[PDB]
Amino acid sequence: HMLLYAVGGFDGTNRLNSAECYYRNEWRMITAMNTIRSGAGVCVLHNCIYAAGGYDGQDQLNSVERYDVETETWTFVAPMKHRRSALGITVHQGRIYVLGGYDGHTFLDSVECYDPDTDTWSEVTRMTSGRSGVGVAVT
Amino acid sequence: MLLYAVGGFDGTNRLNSAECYYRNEWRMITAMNTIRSGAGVCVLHNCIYAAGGYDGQDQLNSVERYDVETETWTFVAPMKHRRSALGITVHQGRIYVLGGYDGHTFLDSVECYDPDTDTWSEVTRMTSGRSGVGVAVT
């Protein structure tokens, strides 16, 4: 926890796969992701930035990639069971939790859980109703 | 130790409701004061903050805070800019919101919330106005 990262997004004309980091003031670019992602789930787990799902301008994404700060390289990990944009994301006890989102036809209520050690995504529970754009909090 | 799902959009209505997962059971808690979809939601100290979002007609700049002890939502200082599809993170006891959509412009503004002084301040600007960004601190 020292540097702020801005990952992907949408500028009103193009959706972004680029990422910048704030330091000298100034936002400087880092290595761009392998996939154009807007509205992705972005979190930090074991000093790696994870980027899950999102919208590339045509399709809802299920791919997940992680950025290694030491190698400055984005790498794909196991993809989610569901494509989703406008998902909520949180990290709890060394695992990534994604909640809801939109798969292209359905507002999901699925909640998937990522185990980094085994590189698996597994559904852990389901919200009371399918919905997207949710905020997630653990306290 | 509890998971909270705040607001959202079920495909027909935007939601101001919130629920907590315990006994493998999702249980509803006190609903928010403002209908919020795609708001910035984080945990500062031990309170849930919900900043901005879309209520169905307008983009929101209001910020309310849920106290787990008192089970109530309280409005705090509003952001200088209305924002939907904003990024949000907590870092050294402060909230950072990044970009988003204000109803006409994709924002490059970054605001910082100090809970002690209840103030938002514009810290810097991103290289370009943008929305739907993921924020990470590491």
Swiss-Prot record, chain A:
Role, per record: Substrate-specific adapter of a BCR (BTB-CUL3-RBX1) E3 ubiquitin ligase complex that regulates the response to oxidative stress by targeting NFE2L2/NRF2 for ubiquitination. KEAP1 acts as a key sensor of oxidative and electrophilic stress: in normal conditions, the BCR(KEAP1) complex mediates ubiquitination and degradation of NFE2L2/NRF2, a transcription factor regulating expression of many cytoprotective genes.
Outcome after substituting Y102A: Loss of interaction with NFE2L2/NRF2. Strongly reduces repression of NFE2L2/NRF2-dependent gene expression. Loss of interaction with PGAM5. Abolishes interaction with SQSTM1/p62
Family, similarity comment: Belongs to the KEAP1 family.
Source organism per UniProt: Homo sapiens (Human)
Tissue: Broadly expressed, with highest levels in skeletal muscle.
Domain notes: KEAP1 contains reactive cysteine residues that act as sensors for endogenously produced and exogenously encountered small molecules, which react with sulfhydryl groups and modify the cysteine sensors, leading to impair ability of the BCR(KEAP1) complex to ubiquitinate target proteins.
Protein name: Kelch-like ECH-associated protein 1
Lineage summary: Eukaryota, Metazoa, Chordata, Craniata, Vertebrata
Subunit architecture: Component of the BCR(KEAP1) E3 ubiquitin ligase complex, at least composed of 2 molecules of CUL3, 2 molecules of KEAP1, and RBX1. Interacts with NFE2L2/NRF2; the interaction is direct. Forms a ternary complex with NFE2L2/NRF2 and PGAM5. Interacts with (phosphorylated) SQSTM1/p62; the interaction is direct and inactivates the BCR(KEAP1) complex by sequestering it in inclusion bodies, promoting its degradation. Interacts with NFE2L1. Interacts with BPTF and PTMA. Interacts with MAP1LC3B. Interacts indirectly with ENC1. Interacts with SESN1 and SESN2. Interacts with HSP90AA1 and HSP90AB1. (Microbial infection) Interacts with ebolavirus protein VP24; this interaction activates transcription factor NFE2L2/NRF2 by blocking its interaction with KEAP1.
Curated annotation (Swiss-Prot), chain B:
Repeat positions for Kelch: 2-46, 47-93, 94-138
PTM remark: Non-enzymatic covalent modifications of reactive cysteines by electrophile metabolites inactivate the BCR(KEAP1) complex. Accumulation of fumarate promotes the formation of cysteine S-succination (S-(2-succinyl)cysteine), leading to inactivate the BCR(KEAP1) complex and promote NFE2L2/NRF2 nuclear accumulation and activation. Nitric oxide-dependent 8-Nitro-cGMP formation promotes cysteine guanylation (S-cGMP-cysteine), leading to NFE2L2/NRF2 nuclear accumulation and activation.
Subcellular location: Cytoplasm; Nucleus
Effect of mutating Y101A: Loss of interaction with NFE2L2/NRF2. Strongly reduces repression of NFE2L2/NRF2-dependent gene expression. Loss of interaction with PGAM5. Abolishes interaction with SQSTM1/p62
Effect of substituting Y54A: Loss of interaction with NFE2L2/NRF2. Strongly reduces repression of NFE2L2/NRF2-dependent gene expression. Abolishes interaction with SQSTM1/p62
Subunit structure of this chain's protein: Component of the BCR(KEAP1) E3 ubiquitin ligase complex, at least composed of 2 molecules of CUL3, 2 molecules of KEAP1, and RBX1. Interacts with NFE2L2/NRF2; the interaction is direct. Forms a ternary complex with NFE2L2/NRF2 and PGAM5. Interacts with (phosphorylated) SQSTM1/p62; the interaction is direct and inactivates the BCR(KEAP1) complex by sequestering it in inclusion bodies, promoting its degradation. Interacts with NFE2L1. Interacts with BPTF and PTMA. Interacts with MAP1LC3B. Interacts indirectly with ENC1. Interacts with SESN1 and SESN2. Interacts with HSP90AA1 and HSP90AB1.
Domain notes: KEAP1 contains reactive cysteine residues that act as sensors for endogenously produced and exogenously encountered small molecules, which react with sulfhydryl groups and modify the cysteine sensors, leading to impair ability of the BCR(KEAP1) complex to ubiquitinate target proteins.
Function: Substrate-specific adapter of a BCR (BTB-CUL3-RBX1) E3 ubiquitin ligase complex that regulates the response to oxidative stress by targeting NFE2L2/NRF2 for ubiquitination. KEAP1 acts as a key sensor of oxidative and electrophilic stress: in normal conditions, the BCR(KEAP1) complex mediates ubiquitination and degradation of NFE2L2/NRF2, a transcription factor regulating expression of many cytoprotective genes.
Full protein name: Kelch-like ECH-associated protein 1
Natural source organism: Homo sapiens
Encoding gene per record: KEAP1
Segment of the intact protein contained: 471 to 609 of 624
